[PDB]
Amino acid sequence: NQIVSGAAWTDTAGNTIQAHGAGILQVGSTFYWFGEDKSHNSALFKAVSCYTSSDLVNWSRQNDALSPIAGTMISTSNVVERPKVIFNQKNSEYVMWFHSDSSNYGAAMVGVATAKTPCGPYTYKGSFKPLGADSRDESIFQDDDSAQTAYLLYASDNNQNFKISRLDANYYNVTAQVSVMNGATLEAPGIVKHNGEYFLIASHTSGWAPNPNKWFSASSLAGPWSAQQDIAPSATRTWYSQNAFDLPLGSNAIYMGDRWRPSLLGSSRYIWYPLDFSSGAPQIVHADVWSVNVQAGTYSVASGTSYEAENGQRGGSSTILSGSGFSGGKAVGYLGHGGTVTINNVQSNGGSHWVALYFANGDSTYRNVTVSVNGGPSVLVDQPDSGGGNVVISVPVKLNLNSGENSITFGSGQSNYAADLDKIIVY
Ligand SMILES: *[C@@H]1O[C@H](CO)[C@@H](O)[C@H](O)[C@H]1NC(C)=O
Ligand SMILES: *[C@@H]1O[C@H](CO)[C@@H](O)[C@H](O)[C@H]1NC(C)=O
Ligand SMILES: [Ca+2]
Structure with missing residues (x-):
């Protein structure tokens, strides 16, 4: 059990993992990693992959969760990014959301797909603009209230205004805006709870280049949200990465980021570090080699x-x-x-x-x-x-x-x- 950020991580078959823009789902004791398959170094849609693990380190590739359809917005000439999957208890249905776009990023939509099993394959339901406004980088956060209320987190209005909006009870559509940070230029969002408080992690907008990612906290998804603070030393640009998913881990969390390599996209790396909350503020622990015990909710940094x-x-x-x-x-x-x-x-x-x-x-x-x-x-x-x-x-x-x-x-x-x-x- 060694998580080694920057290395070429392989699945149980020995093939390089192709799950960029991670979305994690837990079903019982099994973890599901969904992501963008970029194995042919394309920015365009090849598949949403599905890998399973019980320990977060040994990942077994299943059949793809989402596959292209010619003549639709999920064709191999379109963009499918940052998939996220949550389970709807009312309908006993897994619901996938993703950023759905054209190759020039001018469409700015979400897409939705559904399945009865975690790896599907999923059935695409269509793409749309939430409340009629832009959505580019996005995530889905599922709260732990009785209704398991879910929220779309999204860069809107030509990336200028960051929004949080509540999903309907089917997780099929956005019903109400909950929070907006106007002029915030935030993308790559994720939210993780910690001691009843909500923590938003996000990047700024610098295209493919990494930038210093930030954290914000609030007692309600409506805010008020604290002012941005760094999760890592600013000069390192999040240790050369961009947020993808923020997984709870005991009293802390795991920062899961991507190191995007535009000239060789299929070799973009996975930058995973402990996100330590012991100071009340989350901070990446820069651990070149660390181990995780997901059942205990603990991590251990290797000494060198x-x-x-x-x-x-x-x-x-x-x-x-x-x-x-x-x-x-x-x-x-x-x-x-x-x-x-x-x-x-x-x-x-x-x-x-x-x-x-x-x-x-x-x-x-x-x-x-x-x-x-x-x-x-x-x-x-x-x-x-x-x-x-x-x-x-x-x-x-x-x-x-x-x-x-x-x-x-x-x-x-x-x-x-x-x-x-x-x-x-x-x-
Ligand atoms: C989704 O919810 C919005 C606002 O409640 C509504 O206007 C819209 O018709 C619904 N459906 C879609 C596809 O947006
Ligand atoms: C190694 O670095 C040089 C630039 O300094 C680059 O031209 C070359 O393509 C790189 N080799 C490989 C295998 O990436
Ligand atoms: Ca030296």
């Missing part, structure tokens, strides 16, 4: 051993850079293109270990770094843009180490410059 890149052995043209965003105030630059750094005396008990690479990449585009263990064949690790040359994020790589001391060499045999390497943490 840190090695500073600047304490490694540089070869060729690599150099030491100084900056306030780096651990130890220093990083190794000019890696790749003839510069290397080798971190020696990496202790291990043997076997396979997750290693987090902390780097800064001030480009607008990705870099990568070659990684070789004890002189073995290199693997190439993608290094997203980090937000600035003085902003560090981490990405994980699983390395086979030997008992005793090990060496890890970065930047050998690549023509391009890698990102600047701050440190590594070996878990």
Whole structure:
């Protein structure tokens, strides 16, 4: 049980999970992860996937919950985003909502589909504008009152005004507006309850690029909502992610986000972190490797051993850079293109270990770094843009180490410059 944000997560078949824009549903002790299948690197509709698990980590892919229909707004030339599914007790029916759009995002509708079983397949009922207004990024929140009253959370009015509106008793349509934040430019919403209070997590509108996601709280869905506050250090842009789903977990929650990769959408990653409420304000716990016990409502952060890149052995043209965003105030630059750094005396008990690479990449585009263990064949690790040359994020790589001391060499045999390497943490 290791949740490793940024890694290529695979289902029980060993295939990369394709469930972007997550919606989670719990039925009894089984969890259902619905999402966008982007396996052909398209922004257009291929499927709403359905994966099941009892532990939130080992996901078994079922038949797709929603499939395209030519000549409708759920054709393979249209947009189906951010699916969400809730169970209607009155009708014994699962109801899926999603953002339904054209490829230019000019239609701004919701779509609804229904099924008698959690993975369906679902039957599409049509798309519409809620109360006649725009809806783009959306979520569905189901309260725990007696009626299990449900709400659409949505970016409206050309993304400018954020709305919460109550659904009818069938969950088929929006009946009344409940809250509006005019001019808020919020998207990617989700709500999770905590000690009877409602917590809204949302991003701002920066297109595909990540931005600092925010939390708001209220004692009623009608508000008043608190003023936005950060869930993560602002410079990290939510640790390079965008909110997708906020799952309750005991007295805390799990932040489930997407790391969108526009040039390779099917390789967009899943950024899941504990959302810790112990201070009364929710905050992402930046845990490169953590474990979850969904039955206990608990999480456990793995401990690792840190090695500073600047304490490694540089070869060729690599150099030491100084900056306030780096651990130890220093990083190794000019890696790749003839510069290397080798971190020696990496202790291990043997076997396979997750290693987090902390780097800064001030480009607008990705870099990568070659990684070789004890002189073995290199693997190439993608290094997203980090937000600035003085902003560090981490990405994980699983390395086979030997008992005793090990060496890890970065930047050998690549023509391009890698990102600047701050440190590594070996878990
Ligand atoms: C949904 O509810 C609204 C407001 O109550 C109503 O005007 C509308 O006819 C209903 N149906 C649809 C498809 O919007
Ligand atoms: C590695 O990074 C360079 C840019 O520095 C890029 O041109 C190249 O396509 C990347 N390689 C892979 C496999 O992504
Ligand atoms: Ca450092």
